[PDB]
Amino acid sequence: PPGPPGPPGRAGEPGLQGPAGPPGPPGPPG
Amino acid sequence: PPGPPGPPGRAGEPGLQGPAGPPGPPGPPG
Amino acid sequence: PPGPPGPPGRAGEPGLQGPAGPPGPPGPP
Numbered sequence: 001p002p003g004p005p006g007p008p009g010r011a012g013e014p015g016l017q018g019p020a021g022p023p024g025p026p027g028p029p030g
Numbered sequence: 031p032p033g034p035p036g037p038p039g040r041a042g043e044p045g046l047q048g049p050a051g052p053p054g055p056p057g058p059p060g
Numbered sequence: 061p062p063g064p065p066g067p068p069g070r071a072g073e074p075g076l077q078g079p080a081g082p083p084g085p086p087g088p089p
């Protein structure tokens with residue numbers, strides 16, 4: 001009498017955007 | 031008769047956080 | 061009686077790459 005398990009769930013949300021990158025290199029000398 | 035199937039499962043875990051951004055624009059001259 | 065709820069879905073896609081970093085430090089003199 002107990003039925004089979006239901007269908008699988010949906011694939012999860014896409015992940016959070018990554019953090020901002022490092023600062024660019026220091027500029028050339030003045 | 032056997033019971034009906036269960037409901038659909040839960041959604042998967044969200045994706046991992048993406049990679050870090052590229053380096054910022056280069057610094058200006060000194 | 062109805063069956064147990066289905067298994068969990070697969071994990072999500074990884075996230076987008078972050079934005080560009082801060083503007084670089086100005087150079088030496």
